[PDB]
Amino acid sequence: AAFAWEDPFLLEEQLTEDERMIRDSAKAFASDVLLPRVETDPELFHLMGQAGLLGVTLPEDYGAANASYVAYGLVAREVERIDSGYRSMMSVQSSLVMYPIYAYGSDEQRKKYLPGLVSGELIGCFGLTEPDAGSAGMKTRAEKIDGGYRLSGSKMWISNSPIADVFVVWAKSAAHDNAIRGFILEKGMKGLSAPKIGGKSLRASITGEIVMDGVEVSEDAILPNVSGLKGPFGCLNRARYGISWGVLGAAEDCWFRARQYGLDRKQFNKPLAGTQLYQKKLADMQTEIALGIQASLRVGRLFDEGKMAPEMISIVKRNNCGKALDIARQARDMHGEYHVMRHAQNLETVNTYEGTHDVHALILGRAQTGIQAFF
Amino acid sequence: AAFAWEDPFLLEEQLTEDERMIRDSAKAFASDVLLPRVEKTDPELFHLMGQAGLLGVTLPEDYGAANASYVAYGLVAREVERIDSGYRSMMSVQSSLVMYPIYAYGSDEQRKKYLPGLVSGELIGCFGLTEPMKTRAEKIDGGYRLSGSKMWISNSPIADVFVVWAKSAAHDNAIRGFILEKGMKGLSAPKILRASITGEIVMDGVEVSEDAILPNVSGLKGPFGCLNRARYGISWGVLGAAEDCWFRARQYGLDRKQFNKPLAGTQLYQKKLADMQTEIALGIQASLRVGRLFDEGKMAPEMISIVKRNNCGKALDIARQARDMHGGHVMRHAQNLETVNTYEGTHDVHALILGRAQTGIQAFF
Amino acid sequence: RAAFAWEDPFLLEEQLTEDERMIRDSAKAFASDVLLPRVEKEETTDPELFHLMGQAGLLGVTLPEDYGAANASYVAYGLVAREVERIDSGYRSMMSVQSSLVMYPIYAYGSDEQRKKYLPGLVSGELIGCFGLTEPDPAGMKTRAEKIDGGYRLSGSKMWISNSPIADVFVVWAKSAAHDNAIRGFILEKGMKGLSAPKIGGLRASITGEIVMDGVEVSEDAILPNVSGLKGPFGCLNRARYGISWGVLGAAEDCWFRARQYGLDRKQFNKPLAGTQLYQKKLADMQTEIALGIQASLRVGRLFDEGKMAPEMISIVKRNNCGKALDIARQARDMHGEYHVMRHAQNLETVNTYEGTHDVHALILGRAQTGIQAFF
Amino acid sequence: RAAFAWEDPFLLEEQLTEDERMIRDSAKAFASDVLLPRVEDPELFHLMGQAGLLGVTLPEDYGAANASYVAYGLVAREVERIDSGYRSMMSVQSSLVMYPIYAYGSDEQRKKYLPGLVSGELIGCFGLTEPMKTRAEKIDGGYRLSGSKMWISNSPIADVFVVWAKSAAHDNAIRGFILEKGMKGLSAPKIASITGEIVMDGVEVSEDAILPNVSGLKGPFGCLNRARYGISWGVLGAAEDCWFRARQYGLDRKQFNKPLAGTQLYQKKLADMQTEIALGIQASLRVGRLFDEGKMAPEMISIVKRNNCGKALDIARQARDMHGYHVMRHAQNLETVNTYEGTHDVHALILGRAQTGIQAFF
């Protein structure tokens, strides 16, 4: 019976036609547009959007693909296959910016921003973390004023803020009894600045601040349909879901390169991949990627059924980032060449962010036992 | 949203209603019948399993079988090995190594004669392949004469039915399957995990009629199909033992105090619990997918190497980790899984199978 | 090229004194001639084996010749454990208890009267001893010693005590009322009136029990004069753990050698198992980890003799060597895709657990680096 | 009770001689004054040489320190503690160039070349690996060498070239030859150190350019054996640096109002780092002592090179993963170091063959 080593459990037959088509467009884009680059740009967002690869889960009313969370996962996978930096562009734009505008925003808000964000003509950022640390009891405040709000505070380490047109900012809103509310800020607004931050960590990325020096907005700039940490965390959860898929694509790329390198490199008149030690490693890569894909797929399906719980995402994010990083390192060690080293460097960064390996462990730990072990 | 830590990915909602019933049935049996035995080798236990309807669950209702999925076969293995691997081992042999070749490769006569007795558990089978192949079957007037000795055969000393593989001279020395019965002349089966017995199959010119050969299979493909199905069952079964270990380690950690805090309130303990949950959840989705592929008629043996190698390894790691968490049933499971990781076949052999399927080069020698 | 012994990669043999090598050969002869025939035939308590070890001179090797002890180094003590656990952990456990938990405190903390009375019999193995610290509940110890006219009266219950039911000599730790409830050591004997040692319900050559003291009255000379506080018993434990760090290397080596020899004898595809890359890599790890473990235990042994041992050192070798040894026995077990490997592997699981777990020793080391306790 | 130094658990300090401790402290001061500002150049060879850190095991007759192999290791450790590139400079210069000149060379070859290599006024490189095809034809009054070596560390800045070639008339036996920068057929195009080729287009040398006291792979292998030994010591230095950084970082960053290093998970990792580093140090130390006793066997080097490179790389990786600049640098360095001079698996198969008598390479 037929066995596809590159697709052990036949993912291909678990996908809809739309999912396969949308992945194909993602793969063509990655090979034709992303790959030549790897062998930060606002035009690259516009290219991604025009390819229809931004906010794929959003309604056609905004020029989106109206696709499943599974399809979103497939897209991340095809893109991070090229580079995690490119996948990161999509995590921010789609899960951190368009999702909260769509899910928590008004129809006026949906109509103004989403079409521009989907196309990549508008660039967005997500302002939650503040200079203090990872400490949430945030200091950014939104004072109620005649006809709206006045925002004061600083967001720090914000992805794409120095090139953002759209700012989704979380702040304790006076007038909501200090509840955390989401606000949409635009680039030209008075007292709003997004300075870049120094230092070299991923490709195609830029980090900066959001400085709000008494930024005045009307009342329709607040996101009406959400309150509390539930809001930003919903975004983070969806980003992590996409990441759990993306790292599988980079993992695969390392696996395929490790395999091909071992077929191409000869020693004692046989390919390296003709030896047990080498084959054993290829077998472990194949296995872990196959397990990871089935888990993320399952989570995507639950997403679409509306039965996703954030703890599920902790499992696939922690497992897949861990396993993908291990695969990238093993692939690296099997050589001695560049692309495998690049994915590996990327995955070290990816494994760190959006909750560390150990933090997701303790989240799952608390969910099993009812006891928190964070402190 | 609701989260079930014991079923993170909601396996319960991926199963058919038929699958849910058979699992509930398997769960009731393991609890009402198996667990008391282990907590307080038997031909009567076969009859009990058969009477509970848990043997050859994938077989047609024509033989008194459940006519269920390969997924349902896995769920049964999982509920049974949850008590002990020995009880699951009984099923592996009977269902996948004995009933499967008789049904899949056999004639209507052979199906009608043997399967009902095997399904009910009134009849016991064994699988004769491995030797100390040299076993040969000479063509004789009106049938065959079998000579040779099979070794390390599960349940052979208590078996009524013998599925024996032999090079048939009447075919171009090709590997054929033959059904031998306990009362036959040249046939003897000397004895050599819980509820298990191994022995030999000694054939001193055992003469059988022409109706005793399985007509519809030839070559190593025949016995291999049986092993593959047994390995599929095992990949599901070890997850049940894995779960039992995970659940016990969790509960022990809630019950046992150290420094006026439960063990399970500590980071090191929780990380280990998180790993258990993760690997079992990954292993289940994998076995489930392979099971679904079985039913679609799309199983490739290399798929089984993936889930068998992975789930046996990860299940062994979990049982080992759970054992170490009992510092100061888990010992039973942990010891059992060490045996299970070893047989049909080892971790490294399945790795080299996958290695060869990826590269086109065999690395066994 | 230059000579290489795969069986001894770093030439331990040239790091040992002649006396250390002689006592090891002695331990090795005892293990093969007396212990090895036993493991090949289990759940039987046999008090005479203590006498056999003692007569072979393997009990209290670090102790003075005045008691008939070998007056050997702590390195030699380690070598003996290794030669002994190589056969079975239970037999090494006999010596840990007898030498480090019973003879060490009587010798180190006891009077000359106590040294003279108890040590010679314990060295020869005519007396069996046990060590009483742990209670069902070590600072909030409930076992107490009331001051009474002419001595002490001990009452309380010790739990999980090795060899207590076959023991003649009892080293018991208790809160002494007359010493403002400070923890003191007492030597109790088998015949005393309120003393019993019931076996507990449910390793080889090991027997566990309680020490029940129902008002056991002893004279004033039964207390260990030269020690107070937990420093005392903790000092005995540390020496036992040092011995284990060596011992597990013996069981690990036994597994390493059996996995190697099995791979040479068993053929597959008309080639030896040990001719394949995967099998040899496993052999490579065993050799590597055993050789590191030995240099570590040896160094600590040398620091013991210089009087420069610190307990954290022992946490390092005990945790590492128990862990690495268990992994070797497991890998050896799994490579036998049979009886002796399986026996060692089961033993090392228990050994890894007792006398401080892997995680416990990590947090001891963690605390020693950071000054922050992470236990609770 | 007795004192415990978590930074030095088995008291390495008390296992070293006075000379070894002094040479270590001198190496440490050098690395700190000179190397550390750089990580935060042909002249750098001269600086190292003036510090007396090149060819540390060699006789004082060449201006060398005449120290032990333990000291050589200690120096590598202090140097790689800053950066692996700088240790690699010493590995080549000391073990791949000066050693074969000293061990396999004529007295004339020693007197001519060694003082300059010791001082760092001369730079050497080691020519064995190719893209054996390099040959040395017998010619009237000497030899003619033809071929190209690739991935040779420091070849484009080298004054001295130790090249191995199949020498016709020996017959095609591997012999060692000393080549100089100014020579006719010699060119070294480039491809914290620098690699290039050694292109030999019929380079003609006299009969005194051959290393007389060696033949066969024993020659080049003795050199690699010594470099790898140095490496097994050096990576322990990058490893410690990562460990100390991980610890100090865990003490400095608070989370949930407690330092990270106050948690069990963080502490377990520190215990693993501490433990593996202590084991690696005791091993490399034992091997150094065996070198000095003249009892080194190459399989010993396989054990420590493979183990310490593997274990240091894991420590570096774990340290990086714990930083939720210098740790990232070491980690990238150690991955290359674990790759070169024999991979982990090759040393496993080297040890495997020595146990079984069976080769599993093919």
DSSP, residue by residue, C330-360: HHHHHHT--HHHHHHHHHHHHHHHSSS-HHH
Q: How many CB atoms lie within 10 A of CB A208?
A: 21
Q: Give the amino acid at D197.
A: E
Q: Give the amino acid at D49.
A: G
Q: Considering only alpha carbons, which residue of chain C is nearest residue B269?
A: C359
- A264: chain B residues, CB-CB within 8 Å: none
- D358: chain B residues, CB-CB within 8 Å: none
DSSP string, B50-109: HHTT-SSTTS-GGGT-----HHHHHHHHHHHHTT-HHHHHHHIIIIIIIIHHHHHH--HH
In a mutational test of the D interface, the residue from B258, B261, B267 whose CB has the highest number of chain D CBs within 10 Å is B267
Residue B134, burial from CB neighbour count under 10 angstroms (0-12, 13-18, 19+): exposed
Q: Name the residue facing A336 among D254, D265, D339 (closest C-beta).
A: D339
Kindly state the helix (H) or strand (E) to which residue C23 belongs, with its residue range: helix C18-30
Q: Which long-range contacts (CB under 8 A, 24 or more apart) does B338-345 make?
A: B338/C333, B338/C334, B339/B85, B339/B193, B340/B85, B340/B234, B340/B237, B340/B238, B340/B312, B340/B315, B340/B316, B341/B312, B341/B313, B341/B316, B341/C334, B342/C334, B342/C336, B342/C337, B344/B227, B344/B230, B344/B231, B344/B234
Cα separations (Å) of B177 from A282, B144, B150, B209? Answer: 36, 12, 13, 13
Cα separations (Å) of D101 from D135, D178, D252? Answer: 20, 8, 50
Instruction: Give the gap in angstroms from C-alpha C302 to the nearest C-alpha of chain A.
Output: 38
In a mutational test of the A interface, the residue from D267, D270, D329, D343 whose CB has the highest number of chain A CBs within 10 Å is D343
Cβ contact (<8 Å) for A5 and B306? no
Q: How far is CA B150 from the centre of its chain?
A: 20
Q: Considering only alpha carbons, which residue of chain C is nearest residue B334?
A: C346
The dihedral through the CA atoms of B151, B154, B157, B161 has a sign that is negative
Residue A274 tokens read as: 């003709």
What is the biggest distance separating any 2 CA atoms in chain B, rounded to whole angstroms? Answer: 81
The dihedral through the CA atoms of D79, D84, D89, D94 has a sign that is positive
Find the chain C residues whose C-beta atoms sit closer than 8 A to any C-beta of B: 269-271, 278, 330, 333-334, 336-337, 346, 349, 352-354, 357-359, 375-376
List of residues 6+ apart from C66 with CB closer than 8 A: none
In a mutational test of the C interface, the residue from A276, A362, A375 whose CB has the highest number of chain C CBs within 10 Å is A276
Instruction: Give the gap in angstroms from C-alpha A365 to the nearest C-alpha of chain D.
Output: 13
Q: How far apart are CA B167 and CA A102, in angstroms?
A: 69
Is the Cβ–Cβ distance between A325 and A348 less than 8 Å? yes
* b (16+ CB within 10 A) / e for D169-202: eeeeebbbbbbbbeeeebbbeeebeeebbbbbee
The helix/strand/coil state of C154 is strand
Instruction: Tell me the H-state helices in D153-263.
Output: 218-252
Cα separations (Å) of D80 from C251, D152, D279? Answer: 37, 20, 18
Residue with tokens 């657990």: C353
- C281: chain A residues, CB-CB within 8 Å: 277
The helix/strand/coil state of C182 is strand
What is the count of residue pairs from A and D with beta carbons less than 8 Å apart? 37
Q: Name the residue facing B365 among C269, C330, C349 (closest C-beta).
A: C269
Cis peptide before B345 (omega within 30 of 0): yes
Q: Which long-range contacts (CB under 8 A, 24 or more apart) does D249-255 make?
A: D249/D322, D249/D323, D250/C370, D250/D322, D251/C370, D253/D324, D254/A133, D255/A133, D255/A134
Instruction: Give the gap in angstroms from C-alpha D303 to the nearest C-alpha of chain B.
Output: 24
Is the Cβ–Cβ distance between A347 and A328 less than 8 Å? yes
What is the count of residue pairs from A and C with beta carbons less than 8 Å apart? 8
In a mutational test of the B interface, the residue from C267, C349, C354, C363 whose CB has the highest number of chain B CBs within 10 Å is C349
Nearest to D235 by CA among D310, D160, D302: D310
Cα separations (Å) of C19 from A373, C22, C53, C71, C73? Answer: 52, 5, 19, 10, 9
Q: How far apart are CA D105 and CA D97, in angstroms?
A: 11
- A277: chain C residues, CB-CB within 8 Å: 277-278, 281
Instruction: Give the residues after which the backbone of chain C is interrupted, taking a C-to-next-N distance over 2.5 angstroms as a break.
Output: 41, 137, 202, 337
Cβ contact (<8 Å) for C376 and B259? yes
Chains touching A by CB (3 or more pairs below 8 Å):
B, C, D
Is the Cβ–Cβ distance between D56 and D94 less than 8 Å? yes
Instruction: Give the gap in angstroms from C-alpha A282 to the nearest C-alpha of chain D.
Output: 15
Domains belonging to chain D, first-starting first, are 1-123 (1.10.540.10), 124-215 (2.40.110.10), 216-362 (1.20.140.10)
Q: How far apart are CA B115 and CA B66, in angstroms?
A: 13
Residue D19 tokens read as: 């000379």
Q: Considering only alpha carbons, which residue of chain B is nearest residue D362?
A: B365
The pairing of beta strand B198-209 with beta strand B143-154: antiparallel
Residue A275 tokens read as: 């030896």
- D341 flagged as catalytic: yes
Nearest to B263 by CA among B316, B324, B319, B333: B324
Is the Cβ–Cβ distance between A8 and B302 less than 8 Å? yes
Residue D159, burial from CB neighbour count under 10 angstroms (0-12, 13-18, 19+): middle
Residue D124 tokens read as: 């050497």
Instruction: Give the gap in angstroms from C-alpha C277 to the nearest C-alpha of chain A.
Output: 6
DSSP string, A41-96: -HHHHHHHHHTT-SSTTS-GGGT-----HHHHHHHHHHHHTT-HHHHHHHIIIIII
Q: How far apart are CA C181 and CA C184, in angstroms?
A: 9
Q: Considering only alpha carbons, which residue of chain A is nearest residue B278?
A: A315
Interhelix angle C48-55/C112-124, nearest 10 degrees: 100
Cβ contact (<8 Å) for A375 and D323? no
Cβ contact (<8 Å) for D298 and C9? no
- A276: chain B residues, CB-CB within 8 Å: 348, 352, 355, 363
Q: How far apart are CA A155 and CA D264, in angstroms?
A: 31
Q: How far apart are CA B55 and CA B88, in angstroms?
A: 11
The pairing of beta strand A207-218 with beta strand B143-154: unpaired
Interhelix angle D43-50/D107-119, nearest 10 degrees: 100
Q: How far apart are CA D212 and CA C277, in angstroms?
A: 38
% helix, strand, coil for chain B, step of 5: 55, 15, 30
Q: Name the residue facing B342 among C269, C337, C353 (closest C-beta).
A: C337
Total residues found in chain C within this entry: 376
**Residues of C with active-site annotation:** 355
Instruction: Give the gap in angstroms from C-alpha B263 to the nearest C-alpha of chain D.
Output: 13
Cα separations (Å) of C232 from A184, C73, C104, D263? Answer: 68, 21, 10, 30
Cis peptide before A41 (omega within 30 of 0): no
Beta strands in chain D (DSSP E): 124-127, 135-139, 142-153, 160-167, 173-180, 186-187, 195-206, 210-211, 254-255, 258-259
Nearest to B289 by CA among B3, B9, B6, B1: B9
The pairing of beta strand C208-219 with beta strand C195-196: antiparallel
Q: How far apart are CA C107 and CA C171, in angstroms?
A: 12
Residue A304 tokens read as: 């679409």
- B364: chain C residues, CB-CB within 8 Å: 269
Cβ contact (<8 Å) for C369 and D274? yes
Q: How many CB atoms lie within 10 A of CB B260?
A: 6
The pairing of beta strand C169-176 with beta strand C271-272: unpaired
The residue from D20, D78, D276, D341 that is catalytic is: D341
- D4: chain C residues, CB-CB within 8 Å: 310-313, 368
Residue B44, burial from CB neighbour count under 10 angstroms (0-12, 13-18, 19+): exposed
The helix/strand/coil state of D357 is coil
DSSP state of B149: E
The dihedral through the CA atoms of D244, D248, D253, D257 has a sign that is positive
List the resolution, Å. Answer: 2.4
Kindly state the helix (H) or strand (E) to which residue D109 belongs, with its residue range: helix D107-119
Q: How far apart are CA B79 and CA B87, in angstroms?
A: 10
Q: Name the residue facing A5 among B283, B298, B357 (closest C-beta).
A: B357
Is the Cβ–Cβ distance between D290 and D300 less than 8 Å? yes
The pairing of beta strand A148-159 with beta strand A141-145: antiparallel
Residue C369, burial from CB neighbour count under 10 angstroms (0-12, 13-18, 19+): buried
Residue with tokens 């072979």: C56
Experimental method: X-ray
